[PDB]
UniProtKB/Swiss-Prot annotation, chain A:
Homodimer. Heterodimer of an alpha (TPM1, TPM3 or TPM4) and a beta (TPM2) chain. Interacts with HRG (via the HRR domain); the interaction contributes to the antiangiogenic properties of the histidine/proline-rich region (HRR) of HRG. Interacts (via N-terminus) with LMOD2 (via N-terminus) and TMOD1 (via N-terminus). The chain holds residues 64 to 114 of 284 of the full protein. This is Tropomyosin alpha-1 chain. It comes from Mus musculus (Mouse). Belongs to the tropomyosin family. Induction: Induced in stimulated quiescent cells. The sequences of cardiac and skeletal muscles are identical.
From Swiss-Prot, chain B:
The chain holds residues 160 to 211 of 211 of the full protein. The modification Phosphoserine is found at S8, S41. It comes from Mus musculus (Mouse). This is Troponin I, cardiac muscle. Interacts with TRIM63. Binds to actin and tropomyosin. Interacts with STK4/MST1. Troponin I is the inhibitory subunit of troponin, the thin filament regulatory complex which confers calcium-sensitivity to striated muscle actomyosin ATPase activity. Belongs to the troponin I family. Phosphorylation by STK4/MST1 alters its binding affinity to TNNC1 (cardiac Tn-C) and TNNT2 (cardiac Tn-T).
């Protein structure tokens, strides 16, 4: 039980940590993708202007 | 004949002035505004509120 207790607590902490990491990284990837797309639209504007 | 011909040019000089000197009133409107960038710096918000 005590062994099971420690196993359970450690696994739960590890799981919550991984979840928080992946969620925040998902937010980051969203932000960087927004950067990319908005920059692409700037690229299109510039292309039209130059042509 | 020369004076009569030059009279029309002198008259058209005023029209030329009205055409040209007046557009000098302002020409900086071609100057564009700031249009600053974020560079992934203006991202300091969470999924808390979106309607406002």
């Amino acid at each position: 039980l005590k062994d099971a207790q420690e196993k359970l607590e450690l696994a739960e902490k590890k799981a919550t940590d991984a979840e928080a990491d992946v969620a925040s990284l998902n937010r980051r990837i969203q932000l960087v993708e927004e950067e990319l797309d908005r920059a692409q639209e700037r690229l299109a504007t510039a292309l039209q202007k130059l042509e | 004949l020369g004076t009569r011909a030059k009279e029309s040019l002198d008259l058209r000089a005023h029209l030329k002035q009205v055409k040209k000197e007046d557009i000098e009133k302002e020409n900086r409107e071609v100057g564009d505004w700031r249009k600053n960038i974020d560079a992934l710096s203006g991202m300091e918000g969470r999924k808390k509120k979106f309607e406002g």
